[PDB]
mmCIF file of N, CA, C and O in Angstrom:
data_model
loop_
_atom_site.group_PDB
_atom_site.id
_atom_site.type_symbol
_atom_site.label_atom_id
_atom_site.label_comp_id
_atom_site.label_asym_id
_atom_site.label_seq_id
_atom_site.Cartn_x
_atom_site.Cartn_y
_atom_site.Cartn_z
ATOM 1 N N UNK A 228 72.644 71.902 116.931
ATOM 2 C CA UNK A 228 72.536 71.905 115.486
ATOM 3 C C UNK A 228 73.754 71.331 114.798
ATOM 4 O O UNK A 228 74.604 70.702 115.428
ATOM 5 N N UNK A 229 73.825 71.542 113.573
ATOM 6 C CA UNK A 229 74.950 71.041 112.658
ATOM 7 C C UNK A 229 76.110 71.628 112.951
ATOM 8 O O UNK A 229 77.073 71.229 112.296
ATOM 9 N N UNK A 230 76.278 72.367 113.658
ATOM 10 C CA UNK A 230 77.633 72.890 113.679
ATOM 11 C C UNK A 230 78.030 72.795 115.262
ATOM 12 O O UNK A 230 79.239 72.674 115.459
ATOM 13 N N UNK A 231 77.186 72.832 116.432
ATOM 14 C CA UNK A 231 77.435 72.506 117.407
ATOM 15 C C UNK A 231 78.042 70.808 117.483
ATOM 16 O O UNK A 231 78.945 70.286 118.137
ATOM 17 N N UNK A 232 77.121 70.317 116.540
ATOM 18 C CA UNK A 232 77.245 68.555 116.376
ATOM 19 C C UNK A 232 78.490 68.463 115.258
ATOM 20 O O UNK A 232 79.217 67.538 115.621
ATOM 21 N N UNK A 233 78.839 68.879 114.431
ATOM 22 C CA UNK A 233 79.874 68.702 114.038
ATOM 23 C C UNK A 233 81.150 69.299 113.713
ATOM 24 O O UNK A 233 82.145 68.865 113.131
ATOM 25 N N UNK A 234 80.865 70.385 114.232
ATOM 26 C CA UNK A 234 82.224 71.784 114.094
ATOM 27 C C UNK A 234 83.285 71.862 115.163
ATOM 28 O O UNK A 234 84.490 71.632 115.060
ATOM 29 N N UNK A 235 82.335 72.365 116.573
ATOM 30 C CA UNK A 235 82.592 72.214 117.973
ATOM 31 C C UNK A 235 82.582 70.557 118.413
ATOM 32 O O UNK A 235 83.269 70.104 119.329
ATOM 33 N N UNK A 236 81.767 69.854 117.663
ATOM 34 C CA UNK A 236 81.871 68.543 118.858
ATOM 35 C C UNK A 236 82.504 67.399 117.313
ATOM 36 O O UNK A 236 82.899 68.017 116.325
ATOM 37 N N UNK A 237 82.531 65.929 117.273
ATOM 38 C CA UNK A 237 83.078 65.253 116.198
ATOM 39 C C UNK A 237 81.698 64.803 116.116
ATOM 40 O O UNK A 237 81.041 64.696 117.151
ATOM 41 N N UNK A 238 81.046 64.447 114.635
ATOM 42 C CA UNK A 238 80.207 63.755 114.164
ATOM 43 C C UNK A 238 80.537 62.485 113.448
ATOM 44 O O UNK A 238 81.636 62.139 113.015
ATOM 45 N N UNK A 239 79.255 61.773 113.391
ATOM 46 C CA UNK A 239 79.760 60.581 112.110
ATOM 47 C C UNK A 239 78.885 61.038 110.853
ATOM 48 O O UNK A 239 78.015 61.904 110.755
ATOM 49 N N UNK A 240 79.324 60.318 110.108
ATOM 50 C CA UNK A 240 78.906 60.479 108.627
ATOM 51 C C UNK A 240 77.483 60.038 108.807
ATOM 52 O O UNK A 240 77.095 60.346 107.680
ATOM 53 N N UNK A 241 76.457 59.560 109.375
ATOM 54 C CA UNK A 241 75.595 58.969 109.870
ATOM 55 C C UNK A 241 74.786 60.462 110.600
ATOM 56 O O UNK A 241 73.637 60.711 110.237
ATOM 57 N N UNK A 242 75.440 61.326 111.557
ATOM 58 C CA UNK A 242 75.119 62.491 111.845
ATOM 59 C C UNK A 242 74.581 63.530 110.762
ATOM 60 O O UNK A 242 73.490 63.962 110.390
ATOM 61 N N UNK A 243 76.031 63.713 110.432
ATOM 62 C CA UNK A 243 75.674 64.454 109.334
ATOM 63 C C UNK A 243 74.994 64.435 108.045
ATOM 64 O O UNK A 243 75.151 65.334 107.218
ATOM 65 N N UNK A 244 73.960 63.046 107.795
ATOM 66 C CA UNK A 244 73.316 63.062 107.277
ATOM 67 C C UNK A 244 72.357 62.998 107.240
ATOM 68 O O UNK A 244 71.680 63.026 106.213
ATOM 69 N N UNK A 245 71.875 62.866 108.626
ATOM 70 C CA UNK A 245 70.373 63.743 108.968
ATOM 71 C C UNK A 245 70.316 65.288 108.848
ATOM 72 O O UNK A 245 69.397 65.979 109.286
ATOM 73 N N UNK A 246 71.360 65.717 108.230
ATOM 74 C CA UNK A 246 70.987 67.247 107.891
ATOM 75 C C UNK A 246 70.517 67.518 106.444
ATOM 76 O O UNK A 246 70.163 68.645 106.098
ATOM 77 N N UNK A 247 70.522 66.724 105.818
ATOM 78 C CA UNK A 247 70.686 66.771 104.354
ATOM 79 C C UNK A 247 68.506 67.564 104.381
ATOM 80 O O UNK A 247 67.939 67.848 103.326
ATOM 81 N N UNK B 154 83.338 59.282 109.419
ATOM 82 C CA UNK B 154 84.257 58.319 109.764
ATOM 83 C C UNK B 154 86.012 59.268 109.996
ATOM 84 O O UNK B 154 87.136 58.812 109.784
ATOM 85 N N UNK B 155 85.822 59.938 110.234
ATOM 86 C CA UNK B 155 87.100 60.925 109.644
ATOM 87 C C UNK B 155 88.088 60.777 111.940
ATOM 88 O O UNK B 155 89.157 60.390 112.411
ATOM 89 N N UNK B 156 86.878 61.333 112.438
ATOM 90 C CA UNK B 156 87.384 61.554 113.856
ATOM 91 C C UNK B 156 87.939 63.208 113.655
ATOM 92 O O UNK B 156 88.848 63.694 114.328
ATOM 93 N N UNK B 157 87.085 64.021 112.453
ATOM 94 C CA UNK B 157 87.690 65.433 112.243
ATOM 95 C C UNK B 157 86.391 66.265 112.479
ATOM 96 O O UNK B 157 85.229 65.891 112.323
ATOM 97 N N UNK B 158 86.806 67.353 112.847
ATOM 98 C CA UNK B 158 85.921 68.417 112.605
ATOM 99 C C UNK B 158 85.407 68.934 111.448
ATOM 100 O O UNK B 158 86.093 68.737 110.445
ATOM 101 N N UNK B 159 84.352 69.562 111.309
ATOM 102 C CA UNK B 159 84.362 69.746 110.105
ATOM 103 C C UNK B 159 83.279 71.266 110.154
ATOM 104 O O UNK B 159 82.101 71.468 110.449
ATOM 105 N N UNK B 160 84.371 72.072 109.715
ATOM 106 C CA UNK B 160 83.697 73.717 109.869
ATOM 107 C C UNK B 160 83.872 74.509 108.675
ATOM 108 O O UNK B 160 84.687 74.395 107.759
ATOM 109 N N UNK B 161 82.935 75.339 108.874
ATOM 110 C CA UNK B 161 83.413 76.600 107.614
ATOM 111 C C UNK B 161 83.162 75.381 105.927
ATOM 112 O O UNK B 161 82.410 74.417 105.782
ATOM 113 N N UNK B 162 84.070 75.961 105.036
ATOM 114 C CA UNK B 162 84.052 75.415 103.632
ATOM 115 C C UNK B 162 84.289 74.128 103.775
ATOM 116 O O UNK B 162 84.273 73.450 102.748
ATOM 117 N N UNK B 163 84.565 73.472 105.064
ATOM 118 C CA UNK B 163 85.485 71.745 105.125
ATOM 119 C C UNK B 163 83.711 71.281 105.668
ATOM 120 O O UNK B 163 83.505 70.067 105.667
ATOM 121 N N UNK B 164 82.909 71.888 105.958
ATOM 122 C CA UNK B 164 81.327 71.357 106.346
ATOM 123 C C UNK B 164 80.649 71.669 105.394
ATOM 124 O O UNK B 164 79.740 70.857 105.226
ATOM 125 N N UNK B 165 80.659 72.760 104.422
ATOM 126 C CA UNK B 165 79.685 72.925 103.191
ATOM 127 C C UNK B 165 79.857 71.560 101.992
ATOM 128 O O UNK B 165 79.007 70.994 101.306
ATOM 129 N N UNK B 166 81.716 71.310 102.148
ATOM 130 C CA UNK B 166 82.057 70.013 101.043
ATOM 131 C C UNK B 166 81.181 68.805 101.527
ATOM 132 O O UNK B 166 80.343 68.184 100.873
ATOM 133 N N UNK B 167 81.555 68.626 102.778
ATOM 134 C CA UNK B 167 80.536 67.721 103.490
ATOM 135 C C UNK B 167 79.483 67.035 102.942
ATOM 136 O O UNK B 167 79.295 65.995 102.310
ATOM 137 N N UNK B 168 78.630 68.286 103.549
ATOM 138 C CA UNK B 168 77.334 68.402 103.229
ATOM 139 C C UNK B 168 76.919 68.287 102.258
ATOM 140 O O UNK B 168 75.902 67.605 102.132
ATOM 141 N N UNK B 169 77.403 68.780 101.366
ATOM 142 C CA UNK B 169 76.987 68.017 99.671
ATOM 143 C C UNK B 169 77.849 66.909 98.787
ATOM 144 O O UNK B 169 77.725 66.549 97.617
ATOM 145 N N UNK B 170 78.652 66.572 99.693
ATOM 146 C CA UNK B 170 78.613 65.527 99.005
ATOM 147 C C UNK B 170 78.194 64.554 99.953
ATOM 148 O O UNK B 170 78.605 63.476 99.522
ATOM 149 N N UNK B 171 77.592 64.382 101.016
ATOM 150 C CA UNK B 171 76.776 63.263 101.711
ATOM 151 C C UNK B 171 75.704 63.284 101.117
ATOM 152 O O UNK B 171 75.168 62.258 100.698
ATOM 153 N N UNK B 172 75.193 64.515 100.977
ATOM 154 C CA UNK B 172 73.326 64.635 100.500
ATOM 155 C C UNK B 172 73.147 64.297 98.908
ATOM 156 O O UNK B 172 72.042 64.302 98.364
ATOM 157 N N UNK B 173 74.328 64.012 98.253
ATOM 158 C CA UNK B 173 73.978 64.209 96.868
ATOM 159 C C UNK B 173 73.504 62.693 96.335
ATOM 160 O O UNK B 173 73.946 61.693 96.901
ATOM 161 N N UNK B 174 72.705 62.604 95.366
ATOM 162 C CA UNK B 174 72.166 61.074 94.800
ATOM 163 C C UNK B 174 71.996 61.666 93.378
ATOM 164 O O UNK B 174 71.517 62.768 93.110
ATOM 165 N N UNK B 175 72.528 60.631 92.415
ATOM 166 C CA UNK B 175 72.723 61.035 91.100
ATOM 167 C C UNK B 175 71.358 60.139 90.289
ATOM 168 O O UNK B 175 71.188 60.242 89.074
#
């Protein structure tokens, strides 16, 4: 999830905006 | 683009301001 993918691991801005 | 983590209140800023469209 979102926080495994960007908390614990590095995301791109591209990631994190398939959460929206 | 950062190469940062981003948790807690530093992932909620994030998150809205990626998702936001005016």
């Amino acid at each position: 999830g979102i926080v495994e993918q960007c908390c614990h691991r590095i995301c791109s801005l591209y990631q994190l905006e398939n959460y929206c | 683009f950062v190469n940062q983590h981003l948790c807690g209140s530093e992932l909620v800023e994030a998150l809205y301001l990626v998702c936001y469209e005016r």
